[PDB]
Design a protein around this ligand. Structure first.
Ligand SMILES: [K+]
Lengths: 86, 91, 91, 86, 88, 90
């Protein structure tokens, strides 16, 4: 499964990002992470294509509410990565 | 399936003012506050969409007289469960 | 005889402690507690009759300003039941 | 009852130096440290008004050679609600 | 000889990309991530010095295409207790 | 026992300081403390001579990785080191 991230400045934009992403059935919300400086990351998993479309939609929705700081898809995460994940 | 309303401010004082106006202005329940650093605080309420829209408008308007409002937003119908789309530890 | 919440928000803890002590000096106001949101921002919260809370928060802000930086000062008149209900969990 | 003294520094290293200088005289009690972010750390002591005045003078004097002093303050007669934030 | 490798970013997405690139590019183990606030995130790996050097270079390069890298560093370490210096 | 401190902007510089500190002298790592603004304080303990040598080395090493904000040695803490240290570091 692929990993998708949308990172915003502001939690309100992050929640909007999350809601837009989980709107399609084959995308799973992994969780939120806060790292300070107002930066909040929403993490999802699913088929690569679904995650690409999802993160694009999440960034698109979020940018109307607040600031998008990063948008990224990892099609094939290496397995150790699952330890830093929520 | 209940709507979510959010007001995000710089500073806690403006957030508490938002919260007070939000729950005073409509039939909404205060979900909680979240702090995300850089002095930013998000106030979250839930209820029927009409109440949440009215509450959030009220919250944003009141807060601006107290501090800086950074974001204002309503999600009328969350796709996932309301407890699912929210960050842990808020309620 | 309607209750109010009064807030003084400072950058720096010493100024907040000074605000709290100055506010509770009048036998008419109760200290609810302090809240931290990071970035050096500290909010001191009191409750009591509205008039008392206005005078208290004025006095608290004035005292705090001689010690450090005040970022916000605000009074919220509140409903009879559940006056502290809008407050963040942990104060 | 007892006086309250505070030395607030930018940096933990300076607060610890402040703390060590304050507890050097025997009738001064270290209440503790508080962190509020932005690098700000407050050292809080208690004792007789005079001991606390001399203690906070000394703590600030020591701290300022290590980092920046942001606040130095004595409350000779704290109202007894204040013991809640401490 | 054992070594600790670190990539420190402003932003989490860049850190996750660094972590993934590091364990993909060399024979290193992900120890974990640390947050210190202010948006600063440190990803830490472990392995032999050569591998860690390759991993952190690759991790830093990948992270820079996603967000901001603040520091990249390799610490060669003693035989025993290599992780002892790490935060809890 | 003496206390040594190196305070940096960034965790990477702090961990580098910690490594140089323990490698350069007979000092024990007490822990790390984060105080906001990206600031991290690394604290060690040992005899004054070791702590002095360690903190100098730690500061020098950290400066190659990031910015050092404070470097300080307390040869003789008045109260035992456990009393002046913040709760949660050790
Ligand atoms: K699009």
């Amino acid at each position: 499964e692929a990993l998708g991230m949308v990172e915003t400045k502001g939690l309100t934009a992050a929640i909007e990002a999350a809601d837009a992403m989980v709107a399609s059935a084959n995308v799973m919300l992994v969780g939120y992470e806060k790292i300070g400086h107002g930066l909040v990351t929403v993490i999802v998993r699913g088929d690569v294509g679904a995650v690409k479309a999802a993160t694009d939609a999440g960034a698109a929705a979020a940018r109307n509410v607040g600031e998008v700081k990063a948008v990224h898809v990892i099609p094939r995460p290496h397995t150790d990565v699952e330890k830093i994940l929520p």
